[PDB]
Amino acid sequence: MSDKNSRIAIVSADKCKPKKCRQECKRSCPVVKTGKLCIEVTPTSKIAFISEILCIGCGICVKKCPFDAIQIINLPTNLEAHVTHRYSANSFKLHRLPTPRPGQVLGLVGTNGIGKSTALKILAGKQKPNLGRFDDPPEWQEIIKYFRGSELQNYFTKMLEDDIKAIIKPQYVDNIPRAIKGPVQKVGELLKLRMEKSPEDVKRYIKILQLENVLKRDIEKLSGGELQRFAIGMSCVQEADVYMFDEPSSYLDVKQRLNAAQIIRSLLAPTKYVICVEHDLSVLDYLSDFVCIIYGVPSVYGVVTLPASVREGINIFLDGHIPAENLRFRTEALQFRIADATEDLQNDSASRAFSYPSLKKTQGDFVLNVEEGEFSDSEILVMMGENGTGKTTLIKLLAGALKPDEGQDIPKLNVSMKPQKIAPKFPGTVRQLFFKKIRGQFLNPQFQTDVVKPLRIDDIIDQEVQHLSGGELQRVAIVLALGIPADIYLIDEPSAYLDSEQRIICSKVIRRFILHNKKTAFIVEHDFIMATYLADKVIVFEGIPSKNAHARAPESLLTGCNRFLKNLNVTFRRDPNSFRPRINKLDSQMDKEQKSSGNYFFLDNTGI
Template sequence: MARIAVIDYELCKPSKCHRECIAFCPVNLTGGKAIEFDEARRKPVIYEETCVGCGICVKKCPFKAISIVNLPDELEKSVIHRYGRNGFKLYGLPVPREGRILGIIGKNGTGKSTALRILSGELRPNLGQVDGTTPSWDEVIRRFRGTELQNYFKKLAEGSIKAAHKIQYIDLVPRRVKGTVRQLLEKADERGIWRELVKELGLEKVLDRDIRQLSGGELQRFMVAAVLSKDATLYLFDEPSSYLDVRERVRVARTIRSYAPNNSYLVVVEHDIAMLDYLSDYVVIMYGEPGVYGIASKPYGVRAGINHFLRGYLPAENMRIRSEPIRYTITATPSETTLSLKTYISWSKLTVSLNGFQLRVEEGELHEGEVLGVVGPNGIGKTTFVRVLAGELKPTEGSVSKPAGTLKVSYKPQYVSPSLFGEDKTVEEVLAEANKSVLAPGSWLNVEILRRMRLDRLLDRRVGELSGGELQKLAVAVALAREADIYLLDEPSAYLDVEERLAVAKIIKRLTEARGAAAIVVEHDIAVQDYIASRIMVFTGTPGVEGHAHQPASLFDGMNTFLKELGITIRKDPETGRPRINKEGSFLDRLQKRLGKYYYIPRPGEEEKEGEE
């Protein structure tokens, strides 16, 4: 067996634990040396050659900074890169193909960004060598002899592959570049298509705006336009759907498909599985232990690959990557959700005026045990509606009715900052204030919230030190940990990877059932809404000007109304029940539009063939 020993030096605090990992190592106690303290680095070092993999140091570390994993020896033949001794290890690489779109799916921390950096030439793979020497390109090419990647790395070594990279964290862009959208796009344009891209992506109104004044969605579309306008051989898009509503996500996907050169390589990393399905020609699944090691699967067809990922089993590798499958509900005939008679909250017709924007809301109510999904474009009033129900805003007309003195509401806002909890507080202190049982080992909340969302590794960290994704997970965990009757969650999947999104969706579903609570979830990820929503509330109108919130409807009717407004059709996969967006103009797209079934649920026994579009 090959042994991987990884120390997370951000979590490791040897001055606070008296170096128990070293003192209790059985190899050290017998006169050997499996772990020692490096005085120069002021950190411990594990020697994998002598480590027996007993796991005692893992249990003794109070900060969960040490991970030891045993893997088959055969896997060592495919090691691509390692970040130094006791660092993350990557096995295998996704294989890009000329003229086709490669989709990559998997947990955060399993090597997706590392793979992109290697494919773009930003990082030369060290083939697992951590002695400070960097392999030559000839050595790298020899490693991939007889594979599709051999010719690819030849081109990379010769400099004939030029990469254009849309980075994951787009909020960094305004810190590095200055100017208006028009100036920056003109400067970036190498293909003479920036004006067409502006029209396709709806950027006309922000052309003369300074880049520092763009919203998250506008900045995302600007970055997609800037990357596509480059004359490149390889186009990399890392999470292109972040900050975008469903309409904008489909628009971006169509633009990428239409404007990428036919002879180019194109790679997309995406956590929205409906968008990944819509955009990709084939997929690779990245799996492993986040922060410890990552493995790239063999390429799969889009439908088969995503279904294997949801089932948690990869047949080509004979590998189980999840203990239980993720299943969506498949309902053959649409029916109204069975609601209890207990109403938690109701509202009359509402009018809300805010900074020149007006929102009109039709009457509705929320019941015990219900998850109400809220969908619609950005800037249409969804967050305003949630804030009214939470009591943060008062309607100019109409009223909200709640049981007097008995209703507890837990609210997770759309935008989260460290000041929401207190920058100097630790994650453990924040969670303890929300609900102490989250920290109780073995409790249901501890397993479902703390461990599934991997917050147990961050307990000692201060809120002000957390990244955007870690802060988002904390906000979701705090909102769900509180004892409440109604949970108002505004974009809970933002910054989360696909596993974390589905874990959060499952927690919300279980909470409403176990506690007899209700939830309102504002979410742009169609797959998440489809997974958890009992009913759907559709918002329409003109973004930034006026919005109209329709009455809550059944999942089938609400999704049908919403998708018809967008001009998009979706069918559910007959095997997993997940929603799949039809390619525009495909046979199924035309058929469903003609029948008026924008949200199509297959009949029992109905089969779907790969590539029927």
């Protein structure tokens, strides 16, 4: 007959105020009219509760809700089979979990809110899964049963017995500074205590990670990239079998994230089990032997797929569709402009834009050098390189925030600027802040697509910025820079705290407005793909981090990309199906052939 279906309702309490509506949910529902149970009022917490058993799937309640607090979805009973854990009534529920394997590295990739973080806790022994039920007083026993038919069953027996104690590298990057000071006192102390391994391990681990400078600094003092790496150090130093990493690429620069990936992989060689979660595909590919994909709506649900190969899992990810599950997880496919695709205009505007001379900025501990370059109108320039190179310093000077030690840049131009690390320091609510900058930008349809509808800022409008979240704040900041008119716009590292969909919304944003408005933009980035889409020229930075650095004039996309990628020595041939960068291993004949051609990347362009 007909296929089977279900109803699931998740309500957000933040969005709900029963006083204004009245308990309208109960009154409007047709089941309750009849005298049924579908919506029950909880006198206590004073929240509406919707029971999935009695609900019709009508959706009448959803429309009537004045805010948009209720969500009812109909699924083919895809979710019911898999239930691992649920937070509570009408809240996030997790489905499936990632397999662990000894001697190898298993990847995880998904959009935020999927339960990748939750999954780690369950494997860690930190949290016990309720099984979408009562299971609470240590009922590890029931969890093995639920896992039967899955390879995780063996793991759960091991965890309960406590033969193995997993080491976890904590996920939330913002939270860590508050938790630890010193580790107690200074990063160096942490590394000495934790070092179960070789005395060589202390030195070796620090050298490879580029921690040398950072040892004396305290944890609270650390910058985001530095903060991440110390955590990684402790996860090598520890003695154990299972090493869990949760988002190790966060905050890190392009050079550093690759470095972290290699070191982490070394664990597999000692035949120690490794698990990892990543937002970055370049990093994910290198680390993993096996990959899981986590999909589903954010904060509603997230299911883990069956284990897959490294190459295979990545390929399926980019399609935006999964066949067994039969879900189009992402509404639109990701594509990069060919450069054939772009509009052809004679560019200058007023003959070229402004130009800067050689600049120098010296702190007295770090020195930045800049080579005279030129900027033109309606163009976009990417800035790449490792952090501590003075990528941030350079942008500031152009902003006029910083004064150069030598050189000068006094432009007539009006500048809008977005800072790299965003910490709130503005009193006021989110809507008020954005309205002051510009209203009318808020009216535009473009802004509805990218900001307002996806996150639901309407709910955020009353919330304080101190009270806010990381990724949500990021999209808002990028948009705000665009809020006001300026000849030149400056953005620094827009990719931070953002998942796949979120960054790509940003990529479309910068390119489209700049093209249209005929204004120029400088964007700093670590993400390969984001730079490619937005830019026409690039500046590459080089030197040694935390010591000195150098900048170059803007150069074409092909030219700049070869230089940058030559510093890394990883080529990204091309995958014929995905058109994705495909990484090339060191000493090789195929990779060797490329080195003689000068092609690090490939696109829909002519080339051998």
